[PDB]
Amino acid sequence: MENAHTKTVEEVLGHFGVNESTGLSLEQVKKLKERWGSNELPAEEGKTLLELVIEQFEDLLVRILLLAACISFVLAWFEEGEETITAFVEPFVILLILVANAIVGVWQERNAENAIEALKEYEPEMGKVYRQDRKSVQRIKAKDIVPGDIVEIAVGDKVPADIRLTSIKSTTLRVDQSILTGESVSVIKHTDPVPDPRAVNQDKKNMLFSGTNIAAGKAMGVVVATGVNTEIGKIRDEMVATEQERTPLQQKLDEFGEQLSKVISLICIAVWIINIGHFNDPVHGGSWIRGAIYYFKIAVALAVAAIPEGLPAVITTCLALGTRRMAKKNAIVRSLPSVETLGCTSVICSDKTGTLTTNQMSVCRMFILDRVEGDTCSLNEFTITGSTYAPIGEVHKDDKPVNCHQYDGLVELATICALCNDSALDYNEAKGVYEKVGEATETALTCLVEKMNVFDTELKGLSKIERANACNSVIKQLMKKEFTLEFSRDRKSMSVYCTPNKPSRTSMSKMFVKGAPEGVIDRCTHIRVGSTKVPMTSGVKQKIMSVIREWGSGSDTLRCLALATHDNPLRREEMHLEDSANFIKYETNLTFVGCVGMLDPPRIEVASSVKLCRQAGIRVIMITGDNKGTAVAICRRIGIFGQDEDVTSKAFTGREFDELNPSAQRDACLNARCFARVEPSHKSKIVEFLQSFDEITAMTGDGVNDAPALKKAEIGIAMGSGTAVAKTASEMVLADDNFSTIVAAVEEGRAIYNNMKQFIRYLISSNVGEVVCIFLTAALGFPEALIPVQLLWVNLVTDGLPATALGFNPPDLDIMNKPPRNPKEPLISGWLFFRYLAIGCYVGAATVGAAAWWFIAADGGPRVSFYQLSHFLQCKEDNPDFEGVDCAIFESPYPMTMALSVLVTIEMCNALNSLSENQSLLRMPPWENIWLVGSICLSMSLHFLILYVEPLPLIFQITPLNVTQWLMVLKISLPVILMDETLKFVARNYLEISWPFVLLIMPLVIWVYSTDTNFSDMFWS
């Protein structure tokens, strides 16, 4: 309605019916919802279809092919444009492959993006709020938040809408507003009004902006603007982006592309220089200009054929399929470079609490101090049943020594639990499980205090939703809290000074301490037994410590915390200086040193995933801020640490890690799988130490403690049910909150790299085969077997659709058993270059051999000796060598169509066996890739179309064929697959079976080779 930063707290609350510590009436909530509108920010699309198709065309390889198409169109100008069949087919053939690749890429990328947006709505935006229906804070959808409504926020939470600080419930509130303000450093905030009529966002410390994160604080505010009216919504029209897509893989592939373009240009120059020197034959070649333009067209067609023009398209489709597959498995990938480098990940750091554990925390055990007869102390050691956040589900098993809960010490413990926490429960209509608000520990204590510990009141039959609010409200109303002590890692405890509402019966002064058992057992010097207090005893404290250690002995890995009482505080806030020394000085002596036991179940799908990670060669390290013993126990349970293992030099804490010999420090950073009780700075130091060893690091976490370190790691991962600070600092978000997605991401990255390698291998082999064919034909003096339109058609049929569909390859069988690759090694090894050269040499030799076969030994063709073939140009119709053979036959379109068909079929066969690097088709039948088979069938259908209709063969300078020539084509094209299988076998064994497939291939093979009458060839020179 109006700006509120200048206005004070009183009138902004009085602007609406809103009141502090209470909520808003439902009727006025819906009235303001109807008037102002929902808190939804329009998600406009930033990538239109036109730019989406243009972004594929921008690359050196595609631009060269566009230039070649333009050159072909220019050179085609020998007759008016009305004729669009005789001379207007080669530019169309050049254009068709680019169009097909662009369509495939845009379709795949659009599918991936459409999948991603639906995933972002898997968990609707949630925000804590105060309403009049439920007395305590309740979570509601952030899409429905009216202005002027009380909204509580805590550490590690996104701000649903612009809120003015009505009150602060913590000592200091530090809020990170980097996304809006651009200030990386967190900004301290206060409730003082803004004295600037138009304050800059930097100097506005009175209000919190929507979309911002709180680094460290607890606060409650009033929403002033919602939806687009928020400071993040009005400026949302302005577009912000990084515009960075140069992944290391794409950078090295671009380097490979430019080197390959240089080599292809050199090869084309060689073609020009070697060939035109002897060209003076009178096939419209007695003039230099005509021969020059013809051989220039030949060179342009060879350059078109010999460059991989689907490379950007295949990269784009591989990334799009990876992202879409992660979208299906409920993982939001906000950074394309992440998944591919997840293939190269070598160390996975992780956050024990919240990510590896299931994050739903419940009370399980409780011991009070029974009657003590001296050094030894008898301990009650109760047990509590129920792991879900439900008061109704807890019955205390009715078997413990007390079921009426009449123990005075139990009453005191319940009061401590109720009055020493800042958490609550709420009932959501979505499920039957009551949601957790606040820290897990405090919420578990709150659901602990529900049972009739203090009073045997008959609350049966009351409101279902009132349980979570009235469970501890009775204790709260009879004893008024005064103030609290900040939780500091120096003492690892929290303290609350409370004065009972009781009319001065109990001295009106109490202190309640919630902390670690060690800290309180050291600080406590006065024990509580029954209703009385006894002097400190070494035996009692030692037995309590032994019970705590037993609770930490593999049952639930020591999640217990202690709750203690200080009966005689020195004074009511005599001094409250914000230093750790005073807080410890205020806890000199205490009482009721008994503890309570908690359970944090490790996630089921973690251990197996960990077992996968060590199979892939990826080390897993647990870096957490918890105790060393708890961390080691959780590691052993998960499987990072072997049971009964020497963990002397593999587990560390932050303090001992900091003070080490640099040689010892670097050795420990390599060989340690567990760091415990580490501050965020220490986690970042560990991550950067790991990265300094040329090692790719991936880290996961769901807390602010892990937020800085996630930035240092190469890959950052945040769980869906975690703090939004981790999400903003991470690259991949696990909405489903399932640890199995990480190994799937590593698998997809490795699969993308493998498919890229297969595409490179297939294209390089086929195209060097075509180049070797041209060189062999030129060198041996044989008639030229490839004219520009035929070369362009080969480029269209063997490079466009099958190679693009090669990007849909299913993952390899041994993909998850290989060590992670080093991103610094050369893209193509020496062995791969040899494989490409061998396959290309065979392809070229096979095509030249097919042509020479038609000229020399053919069933429906003339028989011409090899000597005559090598000297075909030397024809004067009267040569004694050339007697009885018409030398116009050397212009026959039959050898040309032989070469065309042989090249096409051999390249399809090469595409068939390019499914895997070193795996035979017997192990990997092509039926797993239906896209590749369909593409091959469609391309062969196109070949049969251009070969067996009336007009099409005329424009391609080819003729229809019969069964015998096709059989010869298949016979000369098959051995490429056998040669590739031999190379794969050699690579498998010396360098490093589907019976149905054999039963299909064998009869077809014997059918092809049933009749053989193609031997007795002449000498090769």
State the residues that interact with ligand BEF by CB under 6 A: 351-354, 624-626, 703, 705-706
Q: Is 93 annotated as a binding residue?
A: no
Identify which of residues 631 and 744 has a Cβ nearer to ligand BEF in the complex: 631
Q: Is 334 annotated as a binding residue?
A: no
Identify which of residues 738 and 798 has a Cβ nearer to Ca ion in the complex: 798
Q: Is 245 annotated as a binding residue?
A: no
Identify which of residues 625 and 807 has a Cβ nearer to ligand BEF in the complex: 625
Q: Is 683 annotated as a binding residue?
A: yes
Q: Are 362 and 387 in contact (CB under 8 A)?
A: yes
Residue 354 contacts Mg ion per CB under 5 A = yes
Other Cβ atoms closer than 10 A to 3: 14
Helix (H, G, I), strand (E, B), or coil: what is residue 139? strand
- Residue choice 353, 609, 723, 798 for contact with Mg ion (CB under 5 A): 353
DSSP state of 815: G
Q: Is 962 annotated as a binding residue?
A: no
DSSP 78-95: SS-TT--SSSSSHHHHHH
Q: What is the 3-state secondary structure (H, E, C) of 945-986?
A: HHHCCCHHHHHHCCCCCCHHHHHHHHHHHCHHHHHHHHHHHH
- Residue choice 148, 221, 594, 703 for contact with Mg ion (CB under 5 A): 703
Q: How far is the CB of 304 from Ca ion (least distance, A)?
A: 6
Question: 559 contacts which partner out of ligand BEF, Mg ion, Ca ion, none, CB within 5 to 8 A by kind?
Answer: none
Q: How far is the CB of 763 from Mg ion (least distance, A)?
A: 47
Q: Is 572 annotated as a binding residue?
A: no
Helix (H, G, I), strand (E, B), or coil: what is residue 649? coil
Identify which of residues 705 and 905 has a Cβ nearer to ligand BEF in the complex: 705
Question: 213 contacts which partner out of Mg ion, ligand BEF, Ca ion, none, CB within 5 to 8 A by kind?
Answer: none
Q: How far apart are CA 674 and CA 651, in angstroms?
A: 5
Which pairs count as long-range contacts for 38-44, CB under 8 Å and 24+ apart, including other chains? 38/143, 38/144, 38/226, 38/227, 39/142, 39/143, 39/144, 39/145, 39/160, 39/161, 39/226, 39/227, 40/143, 40/227, 41/227, 41/228, 41/230, 41/232, 41/233, 41/236, 42/228, 42/236, 43/117
Query: Catalytic: 351?
Result: yes
Identify which of residues 730 and 767 has a Cβ nearer to Ca ion in the complex: 767
Identify which of residues 268 and 560 has a Cβ nearer to ligand BEF in the complex: 560
Residues facing 271 on adjacent strands? none
Q: Are 19 and 148 in contact (CB under 8 A)?
A: no
Q: Is 799 annotated as a binding residue?
A: yes
* CA atoms within 13 Å, Cβ hemisphere of 312: 24
> Could you tell me which of 664, 663, 655 has the C-alpha nearest to residue 682?
655
Q: Is 305 annotated as a binding residue?
A: yes
Question: 624 contacts which partner out of Ca ion, ligand BEF, Mg ion, none, CB within 5 to 8 A by kind?
Answer: ligand BEF
Question: 799 contacts which partner out of Ca ion, ligand BEF, Mg ion, none, CB within 5 to 8 A by kind?
Answer: Ca ion
Identify which of residues 369 and 726 has a Cβ nearer to Mg ion in the complex: 726
Q: Is 702 annotated as a binding residue?
A: yes
Q: How far is the CB of 70 from Ca ion (least distance, A)?
A: 17
Identify which of residues 413 and 610 has a Cβ nearer to Mg ion in the complex: 610
Size of the site for Mg ion (CB under 5 A): 4
Identify which of residues 362 and 766 has a Cβ nearer to Ca ion in the complex: 766
Q: How far is the CB of 409 from ligand BEF (least distance, A)?
A: 32
Unique residue bearing structure tokens 């699309």: 45
Which pairs count as long-range contacts for 478-483, CB under 8 Å and 24+ apart, including other chains? 478/502, 479/415, 479/419, 479/510, 481/419, 482/572, 482/573, 483/573, 483/576
Q: How far apart are CA 797 and CA 935, in angstroms?
A: 10
Question: 798 contacts which partner out of ligand BEF, Ca ion, Mg ion, none, CB within 5 to 8 A by kind?
Answer: Ca ion
Q: How far is the CB of 719 from Mg ion (least distance, A)?
A: 9
Q: How far apart are CA 33 and CA 28, in angstroms?
A: 8
Looking at 493-601, list the stretches that DSSP marks H as alpha helix, in order from N- to C-terminal side: 517-523, 538-551, 580-585
Binding-residue pattern over the window 756 to 775 for Ca ion, x denoting contact by CB under 5 A: ----------xx--------
Q: How many residues does the chain have?
A: 1021
Among the options 351, 422, 600, 812, which is catalytic?
351
Q: Is 981 annotated as a binding residue?
A: no
Helix (H, G, I), strand (E, B), or coil: what is residue 490? coil
Other Cβ atoms closer than 10 A to 870: 15
Size of the site for Ca ion (CB under 5 A): 6
Q: How far is the CB of 40 from Ca ion (least distance, A)?
A: 48
Residue 351 contacts Mg ion per CB under 5 A = yes
Based on its alpha-carbon atoms, the radius of gyration of the chain, rounded to whole angstroms, reads: 38
Q: Which of residues 971-1010 bind Mg ion (CB under 5 A)?
A: none
Please name the residues in contact with 538: beta carbons below 8 A apart, sequence gap of 6 or more: 375
Question: 626 contacts which partner out of Mg ion, ligand BEF, Ca ion, none, CB within 5 to 8 A by kind?
Answer: ligand BEF
Tokens standing for residue 290: 């005509």
Q: Is 442 annotated as a binding residue?
A: yes
Select from 73-81, 400-408, 703-711, 823-831 the region that touches Mg ion (CB under 5 A). 703-711
Helix (H, G, I), strand (E, B), or coil: what is residue 732? strand
Identify which of residues 24 and 620 has a Cβ nearer to ligand BEF in the complex: 620
Q: Are 426 and 134 in contact (CB under 8 A)?
A: yes
Q: How far is the CB of 732 from Mg ion (least distance, A)?
A: 17
Helix (H, G, I), strand (E, B), or coil: what is residue 416? helix
The amino acid at residue 491 is R
Residues facing 165 on adjacent strands? 221
Q: How far is the CB of 603 from Mg ion (least distance, A)?
A: 13
Q: Is 359 annotated as a binding residue?
A: no
Residues 887/889/890/892 CA torsion (nearest 10 deg): 160
Binding-residue pattern over the window 774 to 813 for Ca ion, x denoting contact by CB under 5 A: ---------------------x--xx--------------
The amino acid at residue 901 is S
* CA atoms within 13 Å, Cβ hemisphere of 330: 13
Binding-residue pattern over the window 298 to 337 for Ca ion, x denoting contact by CB under 5 A: -------x--------------------------------
Q: Is 84 annotated as a binding residue?
A: no
706: left (phi over 0), alpha (psi -120 to 50) or beta: alpha
Q: Is 409 annotated as a binding residue?
A: no
Identify which of residues 204 and 761 has a Cβ nearer to Ca ion in the complex: 761
Q: Is 514 annotated as a binding residue?
A: yes
Q: How far is the CB of 92 from Ca ion (least distance, A)?
A: 16
Q: How far is CA 435 from the centre of its chain?
A: 28
For the annotated catalytic residues, the residue numbers are 351
Where is the binding site, in residues? 304-305, 307, 309, 351, 353, 442, 489, 514, 559, 624-626, 677, 683, 702, 705, 767, 770, 795, 798-799, 907
Where is the binding site for Ca(2+), in residues? 304-305, 307, 309, 767, 770, 795, 798-799, 907
Applying CB under 5 A, the residues found at the interface with Mg ion are: 351, 353-354, 703
Applying CB under 5 A, the residues found at the interface with Ca ion are: 305, 766-767, 795, 798-799
Where is the binding site for ATP, in residues? 353, 442, 489, 514, 559, 624-626, 677, 683, 705
